Amino acid sequence: PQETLNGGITDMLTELANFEKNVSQAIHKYNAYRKAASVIAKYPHKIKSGAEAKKLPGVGTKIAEKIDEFLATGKLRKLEKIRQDDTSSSINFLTRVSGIGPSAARKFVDEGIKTLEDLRKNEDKLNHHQRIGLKYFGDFEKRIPREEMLQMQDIVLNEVKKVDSEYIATVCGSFRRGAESSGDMDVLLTHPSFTSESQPKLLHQVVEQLQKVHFITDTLSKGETKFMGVCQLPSKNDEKEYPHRRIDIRLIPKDQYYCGVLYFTGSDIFAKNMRAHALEKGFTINEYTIRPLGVTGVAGEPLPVDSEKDIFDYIQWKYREPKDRSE
DNA sequence: CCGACGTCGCATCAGC
DNA sequence: GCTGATGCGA
DNA sequence: GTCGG
Ligand SMILES: Cc1cn([C@H]2C[C@H](O)[C@@H](COP(=O)(O)NP(=O)(O)OP(=O)(O)O)O2)c(=O)[nH]c1=O
Numbered sequence: 357p358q359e360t361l362n363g364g365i366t367d368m369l370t371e372l373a374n375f376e377k378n379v380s381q382a383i384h385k386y387n388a389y390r391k392a393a394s395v396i397a398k399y400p401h402k403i404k405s406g407a408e409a410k411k412l413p414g415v416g417t418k419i420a421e422k423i424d425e426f427l428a429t430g431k432l433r434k435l436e437k438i439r440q441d442d443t444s445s446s447i448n449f450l451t452r453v454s455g456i457g458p459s460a461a462r463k464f465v466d467e468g469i470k471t472l473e474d475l476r477k478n479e480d481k482l483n484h485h486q487r488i489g490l491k492y493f494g495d496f497e498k499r500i501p502r503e504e505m506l507q508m509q510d511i512v513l514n515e516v517k518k519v520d521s522e523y524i525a526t527v528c529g530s531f532r533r534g535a536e537s538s539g540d541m542d543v544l545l546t547h548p549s550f551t552s553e554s555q556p557k558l559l560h561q562v563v564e565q566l567q568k569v570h571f572i573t574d575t576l577s578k579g580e581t582k583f584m585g586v587c588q589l590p591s592k593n594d595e596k597e598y599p600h601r602r603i604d605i606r607l608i609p610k611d612q613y614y615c616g617v618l619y620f621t622g623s624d625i626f627a628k629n630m631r632a633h634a635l636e637k638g639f640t641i642n643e644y645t646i647r648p649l650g651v652t653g654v655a656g657e658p659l660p661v662d663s664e665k666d667i668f669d670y671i672q673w674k675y676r677e678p679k680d681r682s683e
Numbered sequence: 684c685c686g687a688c689g690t691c692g693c694a695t696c697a698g699c
Numbered sequence: 700g701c702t703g704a705t706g707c708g709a
Numbered sequence: 710g711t712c713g714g
């Protein structure tokens with residue numbers, strides 16, 4: 357209901373989560389802290405003790421103790437300590453560069469590379485993805501206003517149709533959900549000559565065209581069905597430049613399109629809650645298909661899908677439009 | 684006591 | 700050269 | 710770290 361009811365606590369758990377993933381390299385702890393952060397931020401009361409919070413599904417003893425220390429002292433001792441730790445905080449920060457995960461960050465800090473400057477002084481030791489992530493460190497953390505998302509959509513749909521009028525391109529993500537701003541642009545791509553049953557360079561032709569009109573500027577990774585890169589809007593004649601933005605383009609078989617749209621429309625936390633319920637109801641869902649689970653709990657053949665609501669029907673959930681799919 | 688905790692595509696690395 | 704494992708991001 | 714077999 358409101359971030360400031362227990363925001364001091366949720367910040368704490370979120371901070372603790374990051375250090376688990378990035379420094380301890382313990383992903384399941386990281387999730388446990390965020391799972392607890394989620395359920396507490398939805399708690400419509402100001403928490404007065406660890407024991408009270410422990411009633412919430414996801415909060416156990418160890419987190420309850422920490423809330424007590426926080427409520428009493430207004431801080432965490434393990435957190436004040438790890439914040440000032442040069443090794444730990446450097447590793448944690450370095451992972452904010454796209455391409456640098458917990459492993460690489462630990463490897464960089466170990467040979468003394470602790471900052472963005474140290475990184476820029478050492479371009480040789482970075483791979484392609486990491487260099488680009490370093491180059492656009494600031495831009496990749498900026499949000500994209502909906503107005504710009506719309507202009508970027510204009511260029512995408514236009515140039516996609518120019519390569520082949522039978523391409524189907526849909527911008528998904530938070531944009532499709534109607535958010536006033538997005539973190540990146542998610543593009544789903546579809547062509548009549550590409551299905552599960554079965555032209556060579558369908559994804560490439562779209563990418564290179566977007567490169568030619570000088571929209572796509574860099575490539576993080578590119579395979580046959582999935583592209584990851586950087587793009588930028590053209591600025592007014594003498595006006596200043598737009599930030600470089602992240603854009604993913606994904607070629608999905610046309611007969612699996614709606615499972616793709618649903619999956620990449622999100623939201624991430626919604627898309628998770630859905631498939632979790634689906635599994636509890638006898639189905640399994642991924643980016644391509646929805647398959648019924650057997651009596652020994654094994655998946656069968658992919659069911660037919662001709663709309664997003666079909667997948668909703670299968671798992672006994674009433675339809676939610678993209679704008680209502682945040683959680 | 685201790686195992687589960689989501690999954691996909693691509694770059695890169697370990698190893699034959 | 701090749702297959703398979705691991706790191707990574709969404 | 711938490712839940713649950
Ligand atoms: C972050 C994330 C995303 N995904 C998938 C499912 C999401 O529905 C889909 C969208 O990803 P996104 O771009 O991180 N989510 P968004 O576009 O809704 O929010 P934003 O404005 O781009 O940050 O990517 C995962 O499967 N695991 C993840 O950890």
Ligand SMILES: [Mg+2]
Pocket residue numbers: 528529530538539540541542
């Ligand atoms: Mg997105």
Ligand code: NA
Pocket residue numbers: 410411412413414415416
């Ligand atoms: Na509990």
Ligand code: NA
Pocket residue numbers: 450451452453454455456457
């Ligand atoms: Na990163």
